[PDB]
Amino acid sequence: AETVSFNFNSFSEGNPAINFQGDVTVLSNGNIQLTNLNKVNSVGRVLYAMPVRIWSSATGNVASFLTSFSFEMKDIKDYDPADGIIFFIAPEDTQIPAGSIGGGTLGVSDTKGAGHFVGVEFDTYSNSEYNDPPTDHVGIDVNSVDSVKTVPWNSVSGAVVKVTVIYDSSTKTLSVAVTNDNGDITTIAQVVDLKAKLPERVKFGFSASGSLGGRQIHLIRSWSFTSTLITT
Amino acid sequence: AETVSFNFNSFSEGNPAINFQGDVTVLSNGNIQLTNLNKVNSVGRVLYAMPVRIWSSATGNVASFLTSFSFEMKDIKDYDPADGIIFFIAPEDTQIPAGSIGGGTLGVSDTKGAGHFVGVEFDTYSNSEYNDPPTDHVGIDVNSVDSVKTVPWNSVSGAVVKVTVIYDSSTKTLSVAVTNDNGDITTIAQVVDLKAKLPERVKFGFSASGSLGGRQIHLIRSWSFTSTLITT
Amino acid sequence: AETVSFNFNSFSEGNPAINFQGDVTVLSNGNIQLTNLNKVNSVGRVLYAMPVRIWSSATGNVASFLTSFSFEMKDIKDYDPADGIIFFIAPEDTQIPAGSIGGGTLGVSDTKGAGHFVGVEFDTYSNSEYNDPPTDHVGIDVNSVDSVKTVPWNSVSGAVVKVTVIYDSSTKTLSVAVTNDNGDITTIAQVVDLKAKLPERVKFGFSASGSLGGRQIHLIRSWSFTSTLITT
Amino acid sequence: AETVSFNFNSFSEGNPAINFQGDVTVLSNGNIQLTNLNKVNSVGRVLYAMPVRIWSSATGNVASFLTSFSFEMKDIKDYDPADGIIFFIAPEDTQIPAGSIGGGTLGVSDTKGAGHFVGVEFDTYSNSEYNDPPTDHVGIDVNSVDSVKTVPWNSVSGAVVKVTVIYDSSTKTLSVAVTNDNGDITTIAQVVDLKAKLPERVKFGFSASGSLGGRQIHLIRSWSFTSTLITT
Ligand SMILES: OC[C@H]1O[C@@H](O[C@H]2[C@H](O)[C@@H](O)[C@@H](O)O[C@@H]2CO)[C@H](O)[C@@H](O)[C@H]1O
Ligand SMILES: OC[C@H]1O[C@@H](O[C@H]2[C@H](O)[C@@H](O)[C@@H](O)O[C@@H]2CO)[C@H](O)[C@@H](O)[C@H]1O
Ligand SMILES: OC[C@H]1O[C@@H](O[C@H]2[C@H](O)[C@@H](O)[C@@H](O)O[C@@H]2CO)[C@H](O)[C@@H](O)[C@H]1O
Ligand SMILES: OC[C@H]1O[C@@H](O[C@H]2[C@H](O)[C@@H](O)[C@H](O)O[C@@H]2CO)[C@H](O)[C@@H](O)[C@H]1O
């Protein structure tokens, strides 16, 4: 079996295991702040430096993975709390879209909301142009921020949220369990064929964005990950 | 929302929140030993005392749940390491089958391998009579120990294993992630309609068993659980 | 070369290869519980029965050894988690100190903290009388629990910890690597001349203790050892 | 804390976590064969792809690490069993020396035996030009294959050898424990200041080589590694 696993309880600038793209900054408390509160259309992304091989063209096998992370979003004065965070999987050459308008593209798509990635978004602003539901929500995104499926959610300012994701290769099912501050859990699941949507080598990471009038604090506090590919 | 959540880092005899059935015993280190190494066809089960309402006949809603636990299985001299552990969900009136032969029934089914329950088994012995795969395995059981679906696995004597289970009401998908001792993960998922297979109120728990020649140490070390039912 | 090697994956009462002193007890899962949770100033020690010859008066050679073991410490209700575990090396006639107060003496020293032994301690309580650091710690002890050198550490209740110790005869260096639950490692090393501090024949083992208000579960799960003395 | 950890029970070609340099080849059984038996002055090296940050210029801290691996060396007909294997640490830009003569340079140094690296060698041939001891040996190399310190050893054809290395940042001590086939252990230790000999980011790996008349099978079977840097 081919296994990749890492665990981050705190991040630090200068660690070769992590890639920073955009307005990302590492706070003194070990947290990663994804966007810059003073920039228009800010965009920040963090990726695990080493590309992970999720499927083999030789065998035809796809990998299974278990990952969990916790984040925090907090409101700032005068600005609309937007736009959210997205945990994504993309090709190893992934870069912030050229001329990204930030906002509802979450730093992973173009103006139409199209891109090459698969991810789970924690959207805190309803962009009608992308057919966003009228409330905060969690959604599964396949090559577009126009979610394949969404579930109502509630973003609480200053609350630490915990997420657990499981991808079962056999069924090609991606299931998410979000544990809110008050104890309640929110789940969403969807069948996504990674082998057909992404290349053999990909990179995992987080991304967040803002606009001119919409800005808020987007923090990533911890992240653990394990993937196992059957090499036989 | 209707939520039930509990967390056990260690168990103790005399705690009204837990039900003991069969040869169960609570070790001094806080662990639960499911079977008696000196009894033929031993069977032990532990259940969470309070019944959980997984679905409402009024609304038609089914609950979602996130639960994780860790166990340990160790070999004893002269005996074949058998038969395994099973995390199950059954009616509130559930009791060890009358005249249970222990062994490959895992303490939840009759001689034919039939019973009323849904669970995830960590089977360490191949019972051909129940169509067991030729190797150790994890499997999804629906009213029978003749698994609906199985995946190869490897039980390591003395290794602490961690499991995470997510059930998404919407898709009715049960996904399992097993983190082995060496770091590799094993996953299995299957669509199971709880509302159609079980009654509104059920009880969750663990069960393990042995035979005459097959016995080993079955330990449950910790268990956390959270379920949320939409009451609207 | 003169070599002594053994490997214990589980312990059993009645095994002539092991010596039990004090409140030691062997659990049904094969683990050794060093202290009695119901006794004031409890003290328990386990020693390898056969004395090992660590140095020769004839040649002047000292032996080298490689040993690794894993333990677990868990909190009990109402009592302060104390006092810790110590892997020690002492004369073949070693016995629990007469009138031992348990507590911060770890079952190897008198009230002043003096004794005849060399060991590595995993101290979970700060005894100012022995100049303990303000936090949990690992330390090298030479004839006293007033550590020659210490390094900060963190004892996690219910966590299985793994330790690897290497003693290189040439440099007379004792190095320890502690692998915590979360993956991080803690190391400490110190030059200790065994030939000058201990007699030719010694015994290796573990020891743990408690007080009136301080008690917790001290478990030893496994232990392997190999020593080689150049006889030429 | 900043921690990097990985575990390889078997290797596979195509795994992005590993870098192959020279005549390296991955056998069907998952082993890595470092040299080509049919090439004159063959040289093969394998490196962990991700660079590890062993020290910080900001804080001044150096990391501690625990790593263990197992190898096998076997004789081939007509050729002298040479030259050996070396576990090394070098700058991230490390490449096989230009115009490497293989042989006694172990694929890490030039003709004079000089290079930029720190490593532990398992030398099976006495090169007088590098002041090699008259017997097989293990040695600590600092920027040269003219070992800073060596200890007698014995390479057994077809024997699986296990090695455990511990580097304690505080003392800057590198200690090695080699467990031979027959059970005896061999140890060697030496104080090496990584911060003064290597840059902040380095790569870890193995290397082996042969000559015209000296060739043998050099196999790497497994490798686990954990390093922890105090980021504070
Ligand atoms: O208001 C938050 C959202 O802003 C939208 O962009 C706004 C911009 O912030 C404001 O200055 C208004 O003038 O013009 C834009 C369109 O209304 C983003 O499109 C949306 O994604 C949120 O960030
Ligand atoms: O509190 C844990 C520590 O106890 C110390 O002994 C205590 C005793 O247990 C407590 O009940 C208090 O009454 O009296 C003693 C000291 O004031 C031990 O000395 C220390 O080693 C811990 O065990
Ligand atoms: O005999 C093993 C050693 O070979 C040395 O190279 C030899 C070469 O093998 C032989 O063909 C004759 O040509 O001369 C060379 C020098 O004696 C290597 O130098 C030595 O490192 C061993 O590999
Ligand atoms: O061997 C473990 C295995 O035993 C099967 O039952 C055995 C029984 O233990 C043995 O003593 C008897 O001689 O043969 C039986 C099989 O023919 C159980 O059925 C199986 O579940 C395991 O426990």
Ligand SMILES: [Ca+2]
């Ligand atoms: Ca949106």
Ligand SMILES: [Ca+2]
């Ligand atoms: Ca079975």
Ligand SMILES: [Ca+2]
């Ligand atoms: Ca103390």
Ligand SMILES: [Ca+2]
């Ligand atoms: Ca040589």
Ligand SMILES: [Mn+2]
């Ligand atoms: Mn959205």
Ligand SMILES: [Mn+2]
């Ligand atoms: Mn089965």
Ligand SMILES: [Mn+2]
């Ligand atoms: Mn101490």
Ligand SMILES: [Mn+2]
């Ligand atoms: Mn040499």
